[PDB]
């Protein structure tokens, strides 16, 4: 049923007349006079007509001699067991030159809302290999922990480093890593795909790639595809899944574009009025479920415009995600890799994955000690450069010597240097050993002499 009734063309928007049975957000494709085939989507449908937006642009179309076909279905995704290892686009089409998969079933990428009473809260600790993340702001399964970066802060190295080193411990369940890429430069895209190939993580992960020049309407669909794929691996295959999305700032910029297309008036800071809700729709889809052995964990990455948290992108994200991992320009320009600053960083469910059974029995006790000692050391450092070295009590001077040794040896491991949890914990002791036995008032008599050098 191909209609040759194209009435209007304004911008990327196109108007089709004399139609029926057409649904909202229904996928369409337009056959041109030259034969070129472009896809589209119904943005608005009235009683005897419908508005559609073409993904591949509107350049060079003759309205009289072109035709439109309605496929009678929304953006769906091909679900298959044989999916891991291959690289896809924003729409789900293969990009890896491999054997085209036969899907088990097609599902709507929007998904459904999980029943509050159905939700089962997460307990299992997840190891990412990064000390600053695996000890001070520990990641737990089913958690939603984002990463706050800036233009040029190595958030792409850390993104690669996580999925490579991210591993469940002991649990006989296999580990899935649904990676999703949003509106990124080719180099950044090529970087990630290559890096996952060589590390063998490609055979342990699923990849959804979306370049910057790719149409904005599929930039918005890219996460929804990955999350639907991630939900296909956890809840219907019983696998522990980890999701990584980059960039999330690019997702919003593309989300803004189709709003002006619908001529919808922006709510705040130029971003639409459903930004918070639209984020929650694809963020809040993570966690364990009662009765099922699945697991969905998200690590969304976003670049704060000009290093500001009060910006709508990282601010609204905070109301949805539990905690945040923040990279600092001052750290990266000092050679710290990864440039994670632990003071503004936070994990709201960290204690759920600490303690005996998940990690070493001093995990929580140590964590707060290193943390409080860092702040004190930083304050000793700031007073030192203003009043001289001598104004310091020489144990405030060792707190200062502690605080830079803390960043250079503990925080800075390297983007290609894996650190297991045990190696990180006794490392803290090795640094806490600098401090005498007198100040360590966060640790008890079982643990202080059971582990301290």
């Amino acid at each position: 049923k191909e209609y040759r009734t194209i009435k209007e063309v304004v911008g990327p928007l196109m108007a089709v007349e004399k139609v029926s049975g057409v649904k909202y957000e229904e996928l369409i494709e337009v056959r041109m006079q030259n034969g070129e085939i472009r896809r589209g989507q119904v943005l608005e449908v009235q009683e005897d007509k419908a508005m559609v937006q073409i993904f591949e642009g509107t350049s060079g179309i003759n309205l009289k001699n072109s035709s439109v076909r309605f496929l009678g279905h929304p953006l769906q995704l091909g679900v298959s067991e044989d999916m891991i290892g291959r690289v896809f686009d924003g729409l789900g089409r293969p990009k890896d030159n491999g054997p085209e998969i036969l899907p088990e079933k097609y599902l709507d990428i929007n998904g459904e809302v999980i029943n509050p009473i159905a939700r089962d809260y997460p307990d299992e600790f997840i190891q990412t290999g990064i000390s600053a993340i695996d000890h001070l702001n520990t990641l737990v399964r089913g958690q939603k922990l984002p990463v706050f970066s800036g233009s040029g802060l190595p958030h792409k190295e850390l993104a690669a480093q996580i999925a490579r080193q991210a591993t469940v411990l002991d649990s006989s369940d296999d580990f899935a890593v649904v990676f999703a890429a949003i509106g990124i430069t080719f180099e950044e895209a090529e970087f990630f795909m290559e890096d996952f190939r060589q590390t063998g993580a490609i055979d342990r992960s699923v990849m959804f790639m979306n370049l910057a020049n790719d149409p904005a309407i599929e930039r918005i669909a890219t996460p929804r595809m990955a999350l639907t794929a991630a939900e296909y691996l956890a809840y219907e295959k019983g696998m522990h899944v980890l999701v990584i999305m980059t960039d999330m700032t690019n997702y919003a910029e593309a989300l803004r574009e189709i709003s002006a297309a619908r001529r919808e008036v922006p709510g705040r800071r130029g971003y639409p009025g459903y930004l918070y809700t639209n984020l929650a729709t694809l963020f809040e889809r993570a966690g364990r479920i009662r009765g099922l052995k699945g697991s969905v964990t998200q690590i969304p990455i976003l670049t704060m415009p000009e290093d500001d948290k009060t910006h709508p992108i990282p601010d609204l994200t905070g109301y949805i995600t539990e905690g945040q991992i923040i990279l600092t320009r001052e750290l990266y320009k000092s050679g710290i890799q990864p440039p994670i600053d632990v003071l503004p960083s936070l994990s709201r469910l960290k204690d759920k994955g600490t303690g005996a059974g998940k990690t070493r029995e001093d995990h929580a006790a140590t964590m707060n000690q290193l943390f409080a000692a860092y702040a004190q050391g930083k304050q000793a450092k700031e007073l030192a450069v203003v009043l001289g070295e001598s104004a310091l009590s020489d144990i405030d001077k060792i707190y200062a010597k502690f605080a830079e040794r803390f960043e250079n040896e503990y925080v800075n491991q390297g983007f290609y240097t894996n650190r297991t949890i045990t190696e990180t914990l006794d490392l803290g002791w090795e640094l806490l050993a600098m401090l005498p036995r007198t100040e360590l008032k966060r640790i008890k008599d079982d643990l202080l002499d059971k582990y301290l050098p």
Binding site: V9, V10, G60, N62, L63, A212, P215, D247, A260, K333
Partner: protein, 586 residues
């Protein structure tokens, strides 16, 4: 032959009915004058046309005839050393056809000399199963660059005939036996500007470029095929920088695209570039450059054209295998041009009135650059380096243009009015400016020069980083107050920013500094940086050493001015600072 009729004229926007045969983004001739316009949208019978010329005096009833083809540029001999318009029209020829010092209206003109003889040496043999992109011969347009004629896309067959000899770009120089029929080719091929020229695949830019500017070549380097942005308020020197890069770049071809910016800036280029001479070409710079001029008082719709034409010409020579650099000055003008047309169309605007599709349209421009391999199977590598000039209002880099640019580039040279105030030229803010190509450029360069360059540039930046944190206290505590050894840090960073970074582009020798000479200045200062630390470790008072500096510091202040060939002077002055604290410590 469907002749449309105008029903509405409002500035640069012309609405014309009876255009149902025409297609979107086709070029048109509007009115009795036949001014160059383009269909942007089509509602039923009526088409909307933006005009690339002034519409003063155009009214309803007047005819409009379509051309059937989109905005395209011709690629062949006669394209170099020529200043073109945003729609590619030879201004020199335009002046020679219109007989006026001004730009007329409705005057069509072919962008290349179709009445010129070019010797074409055929370098492929007959009966070869060629494909798209394969070279069939070259024409020495310049003494330094040869114009390799390639097989236009969509054409694969077997060569029937080919021979050397003098032709124009009109008459057939070859014949290919395609399946769809017999197709003969010529030296000229035309390509739509808003369509990325196809490639085999695309590479990561590894090779650092030679800017000659010490600030960027050292701390914030851009590779061959990298994307650099230069945001800064008016007077910061955005145009100067791009002029300095165009003059002394180690690339093989440059396309300086001047849209929405001053006219004198372009007449300046055509007056001087023929007179300047610099390697890797033994000849002039005009035999390497291509100009696309669009003044600020030129038609607004023609601004977007100028950008998309300059990048298509770049992609053209990229497909040959040449390394090309395109300078867009300024990219903000393109956006401001889009903002008007968005407003005139009463479209729902995004941030600061800019179209919501600004971020996507900019990404298309930068994802059409970089090092790639061309088509065919000769597998020549070609790179497109983008040096974009962004001009944010008020100097605020939080604008939509700068923001969407810094999301799809790897290099950013932030300028600030504070340094241009001090006449700190070039005014690149070293604290925030950044290049993601830093680590890899350092690797390449420490191999080539075989000096510990990677270790030097990182610590040279640290003395700068420390300088910033140490003036934060000078306001509070004073200069002589504390951290006396840090004063040396401040007075060697003082030399870093004043003897190494401050690079005036006006003097006849510090206009360009070769990599090898660029080494010595960096070398001399951090030697002293530790030689100072060597004296404060023994106990020699810093005032004493500072006198020892002043005696030899005057020399390094001059080190910028010493010629390239005699680098030993900058190598030996190093030996003099090894001397002083041997004669000043005892």
């Amino acid at each position: 032959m469907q002749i449309g009729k105008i029903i509405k004229v409002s500035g640069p926007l012309v609405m014309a009915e009876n255009m149902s045969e025409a297609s979107i983004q086709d070029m048109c001739l509007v009115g009795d004058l036949g001014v160059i316009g383009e269909i942007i949208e089509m509602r039923q019978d009526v088409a909307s046309i933006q005009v690339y010329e002034e519409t003063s005096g155009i009214g309803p009833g007047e005819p409009v005839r379509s051309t059937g083809e989109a905005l395209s540029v011709e690629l062949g001999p006669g394209i170099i050393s020529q200043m073109f318009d945003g729609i590619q029209r030879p201004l020199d020829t335009f002046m020679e056809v219109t007989q006026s010092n001004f730009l007329g209206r409705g005057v069509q003109l072919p962008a290349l000399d179709h009445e010129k003889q070019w010797w074409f040496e055929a370098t492929i043999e007959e009966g070869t199963e060629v494909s798209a992109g394969d070279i069939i011969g070259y024409v020495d347009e310049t003494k330094i660059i040869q114009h390799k004629i390639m097989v236009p896309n969509g054409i694969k067959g077997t060569v029937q005939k080919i021979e050397s000899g003098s032709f124009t770009i009109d008459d057939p120089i070859c014949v290919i036996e395609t399946e769809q029929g017999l197709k003969e080719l010529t030296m000229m091929q035309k390509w739509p500007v808003r369509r990325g020229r196809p490639i085999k695949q695309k590479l990561n830019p590894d090779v650092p470029m030679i800017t000659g500017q010490r600030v960027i070549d050292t701390f914030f380097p851009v590779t061959k095929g990298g994307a650099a942005a230069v945001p800064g308020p008016f007077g910061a020197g955005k145009t100067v920088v791009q002029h300095q890069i165009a003059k002394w770049s180690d690339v093989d071809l440059v396309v300086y695209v001047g849209c929405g910016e001053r006219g004198n800036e372009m007449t300046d280029v055509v007056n001087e570039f023929p007179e300047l001479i610099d390697p890797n070409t033994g000849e002039s710079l005009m035999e390497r450059t291509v100009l696309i001029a669009n003044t600020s008082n030129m038609p607004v719709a023609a601004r977007e054209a100028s950008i998309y034409t300059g990048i298509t010409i770049a992609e053209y020579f990229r497909d040959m295998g040449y390394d090309v650099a395109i300078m867009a000055d300024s990219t903000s003008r393109w956006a401001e041009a889009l903002r008007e047309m968005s407003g005139r169309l009463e479209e729902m605007p995004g941030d600061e009135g800019y179209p919501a599709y600004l971020g996507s349209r900019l990404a298309e421009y930068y994802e059409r650059s970089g090092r790639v391999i061309a088509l065919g199977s000769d597998q020549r590598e070609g790179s497109i380096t983008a040096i974009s000039a962004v001009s944010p209002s008020g100097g605020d880099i939080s604008e939509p243009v700068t923001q969407n640019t810094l999301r799809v580039v790897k290099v950013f040279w932030g300028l600030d009015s504070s340094l241009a105030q001090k006449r700190h030229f070039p005014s690149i803010n070293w604290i925030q400016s950044y290049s993601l190509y830093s680590t890899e450029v350092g690797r390449y360069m420490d191999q080539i020069l075989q000096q510990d360059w990677s270790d030097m540039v990182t610590e040279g930046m640290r003395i700068l980083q420390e300088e910033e944190q140490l003036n934060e206290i000078v306001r509070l505590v004073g200069i002589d107050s504390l951290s006396d050894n840090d004063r040396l840090t401040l007075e060697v960073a003082k030399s870093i920013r004043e003897d190494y970074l401050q690079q005036n582009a006006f003097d006849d020798v510090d206009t360009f500094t070769s990599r090898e000479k660029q080494f010595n200045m960096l070398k001399v200062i951090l030697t002293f940086g530790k030689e100072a630390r060597k004296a404060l470790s023994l106990g020699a008072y810093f005032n004493e050493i500072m006198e020892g500096t002043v005696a030899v510091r005057e020399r390094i202040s001059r080190s910028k001015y010493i010629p390239e060939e005699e680098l030993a002077k900058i190598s030996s002055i190093n030996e003099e600072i090894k001397e002083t604290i041997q004669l000043i410590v005892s």
